[PDB]
Amino acid sequence: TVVSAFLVPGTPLPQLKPEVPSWGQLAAATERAGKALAASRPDVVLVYSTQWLAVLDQQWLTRPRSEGVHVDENWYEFGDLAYDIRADTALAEACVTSSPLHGVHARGVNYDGFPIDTGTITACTLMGIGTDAFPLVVGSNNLYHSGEITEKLAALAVDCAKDQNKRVAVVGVGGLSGSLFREEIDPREDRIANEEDDKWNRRVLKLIEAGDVSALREAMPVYAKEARVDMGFKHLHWILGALKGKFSGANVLGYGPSYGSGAAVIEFRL
């Protein structure tokens, strides 16, 4: 069922202003992950974005085709994010159905003009996903779900794909440490905000390259709080859940700054 897994940044900076060295590196690395994703030949891509926020029922993108031009509420000055996202409605709808059966009330979202988040868009763009060849099944980040519940949504979804005999590539979109600079800076000087967040980002990263799931699960919460990790690192729980809490190694294809926050592209070795 699952044939690929990746963790990519949700920041739109890499796509918008790649001419900035460190940002271009991330963009390029996110692109390399896309290539890997394509080689695994998935039929669907199981996406979870830190910025796609749910407050009530869990949400799943169920609209066949979504297209438009998104402008980031924060980085609107660096350019626009055009998109044409295609979803696997059959699989997505099955997830809407299976969800309440695992204790989570959920619904599908199919509305012309529905606001698809920045992370999901730049991910599709840079990675070359969300195409009819690689439709998406997107699962919202409900602010009230714990990491554990996040893993249950992902496993739940993976099972629906098994029953539909489809090859699934999973992608969790989100940043790492989140100490976003609070004043304007010269993009050419961007860097992780602290040496602390850096050490932290590097530490758990190495843990991911080792597949030491055991130790990773131990650091995760401490790491999330001390390094103000993007949305509790739930986008990582998404990957773990969809892989049944197990995997070996990983290849960090890129790691750099995003206006102070940390961001990376992780290629998992099932």
């Binding site: 926020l53 407050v55 000055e77 509305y111 012309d112 003009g113 976003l180 609070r182 304007e184």
Partner: protein
């Protein structure tokens, strides 16, 4: 000269309110709903209409920014505002006009005041569903230019104390801006009170037999708070705000209600309550601080 801040009123952004009204610009249609809050806004509407302001300034919790405080900066903006949590109730086609000149005076004045600001010059930008919702509630005519302000992160990233401080400064910068432009404006604090809530509609979102305070404790906090502003005990409500925010998860944290009063210099003026109602358990109150008819509206 003679810049003036006519009045400033707490004006919540519940989409259910526009949904129940069934305006031409909202796509989905209801069988009505939330009439009590609607009637309350009806009063607010009349007041505003008789105000004849040059511009409406609004601060919305749904335009969150990490780097400083942003301000809408293109003359004409429009689009289709789809509420992400309630897309089945709010899908609105809008087209508004921005008082860029004033928005810029606010930003510059904010810069000089020590805050980082930025004008939003991207013409493709989609204005908040909350900003759009609030604007529609007090002015369905869409005939007054506006200045949309973003809710900076400070309250959440730092803390309520350092966050409210920024909002206070923003408010003062806003006042200085109005006074230098000679604008006759009205302030709009788009914040709900108690924000504890239910979890999904009863299939028929308008079924009012299923609308009520989410928690007794939240309701009492709201009651206690709005009653105090009515007594004009403004300084007192601001002492309780942090506790109010903490205990009732009040959206007043979500940016500012603090920016407004700061702009109005925290007038110990009795607030006029138009109505209080519940939407998804969440406490919403529509009130006014009529500075004109109080002899406090002129800035000179």
């Amino acid at each position: 000269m003679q810049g003036e801040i006519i009045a400033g009123f707490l004006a919540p952004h519940p989409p259910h309110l526009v949904y129940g009204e069934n305006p031409p610009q909202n796509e989905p249609r209801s069988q009505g709903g939330w009439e009590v809050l609607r009637w309350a806004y009806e009063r607010a509407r009349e007041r505003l209409d008789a105000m004849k302001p040059d511009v409406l300034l609004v601060h919305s919790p749904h335009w969150i920014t990490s780097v400083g405080h942003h301000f809408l900066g293109v003359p004409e903006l429009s689009g289709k505002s789809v509420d992400p949590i309630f897309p089945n109730v709010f899908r609105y086609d809008f087209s508004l006009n921005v008082d860029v000149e004033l928005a810029e005076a606010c930003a510059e004045e904010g810069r000089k005041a020590g805050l980082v600001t930025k004008m939003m010059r991207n013409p493709k930008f989609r204005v908040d569903y909350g900003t759009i919702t609030t604007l529609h509630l007090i002015r369905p005519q869409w005939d007054i230019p506006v200045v949309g302000i973003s809710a900076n992160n400070s309250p959440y990233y730092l803390n309520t104390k350092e966050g409210m401080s920024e909002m206070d400064v923003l408010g003062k910068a806003t006042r200085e801006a109005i006074r230098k432009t000679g604008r006759k404006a009205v302030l709009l604090a788009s914040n709900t009170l108690s924000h504890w809530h239910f979890h999904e509609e009863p299939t028929i979102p308008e079924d009012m037999s299923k609308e009520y305070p989410a928690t007794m404790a939240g309701y009492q906090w709201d009651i206690r708070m709005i009653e105090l502003m009515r007594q004009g005990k403004t300084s007192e409500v601001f002492k309780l705000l942090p506790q109010f925010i903490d205990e009732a998860f009040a959206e007043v944290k979500s940016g500012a209600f603090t920016w407004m009063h700061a702009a109005m210099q925290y007038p110990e003026l009795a607030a006029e309550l138009f109505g209080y109602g519940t939407v998804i358990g969440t406490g919403n109150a529509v009130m006014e601080w009529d500075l004109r008819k109080a002899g406090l509206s002129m800035l000179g």
